[PDB]
Design a protein around this ligand. Structure first.
Ligand SMILES: *C(=N)CNC(=O)CNC(=O)[C@H](Cc1ccccc1)NC(=O)[C@@H](NS(C)(=O)=O)c1cccc(Cl)c1
Ligand SMILES: [Zn+2]
Lengths: 202, 11
């Protein structure tokens, strides 16, 4: 998959630098950002693990919205079952630190954009965070960046009928990164290999 | 891009 260093460079290239808090493990505390846009890349696993799967969290103080973009679009129950990941505290702390009434909207993706054998989660994260830094009121859909890819219902993740779509999402993502990121451009072959649609099958 | 769901959470 992707290392932290790679995602850090890519996010910087995509203009997310002023809002981007860093890459973290599942212990990311939540947002203390009552007056600023903020985002982070968060692993489902602890650092002691080496790392497992990447998600993006983002915070918009104007609408008081905390975004969760996880590329498979797993339900909260499924995030805990598959990756042992829970984020209830991070939401709680974000709300209490950053919302004047201690109320937020959690907006989370409910669809997969990524294929079941793909190791591109980190990179789909960067792409979402490009969307968020340019269109913070509408980063999930209906924006120039996310319009390039297509969500499929999470229940169909392993259906053979959606696989060409999930593959085409991946190619659009790499095309996107070729044009937006000097880092990806200069490591194109390595990153493509480490993250390929079929990666969990080698 | 993706469908999303919006949940109001108060603390
Ligand atoms: C998505 N579908 C495929 N999953 C991933 O890409 C998840 N990737 C990681 O967790 C990477 C794995 C890795 C490790 C070394 C070199 C390349 C790729 N993990 C990390 O980057 C790891 N930091 S490290 C081991 O590079 O110092 C890490 C960073 C932050 C949090 C966590 Cl939990 C681990
Ligand atoms: Zn293959």
């Amino acid at each position: 998959g992707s290392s932290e260093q790679e995602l850090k460079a890519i996010v910087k290239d995509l203009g997310c630098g002023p809002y981007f808090l860093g890459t973290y493990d599942k212990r990311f505390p939540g947002f203390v950002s009552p007056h600023k846009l903020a985002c982070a890349i968060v692993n489902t696993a602890g650092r002691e693990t080496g790392g497992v799967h990447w998600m993006a969290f983002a915070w918009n103080p104007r609408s008081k919205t905390c975004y969760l973009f996880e590329p498979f679009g797993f339900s909260d129950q499924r995030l805990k079952q598959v990756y042992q990941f829970e984020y209830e505290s991070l939401l709680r702390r974000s709300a209490i630190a950053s919302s004047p009434d201690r109320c937020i909207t959690l907006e989370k993706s409910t669809q997969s954009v990524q294929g079941p054998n793909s190791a591109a989660c980190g990179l789909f994260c960067c792409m979402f965070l490009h969307a968020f830094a340019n269109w913070p009121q509408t980063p999930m859909d209906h924006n120039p960046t996310m319009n390039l890819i297509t969500g499929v219902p999470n229940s169909m993740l392993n259906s053979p009928q959606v696989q060409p779509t999930l593959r085409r999402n991946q190619e659009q993502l790499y095309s996107f990164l070729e044009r937006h990121s000097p880092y990806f451009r200069s490591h194109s072959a390595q990153i493509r290999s480490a993250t390929s649609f079929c990666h969990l099958k080698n | 891009g993706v469908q999303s769901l919006k949940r109001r959470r108060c603390f």
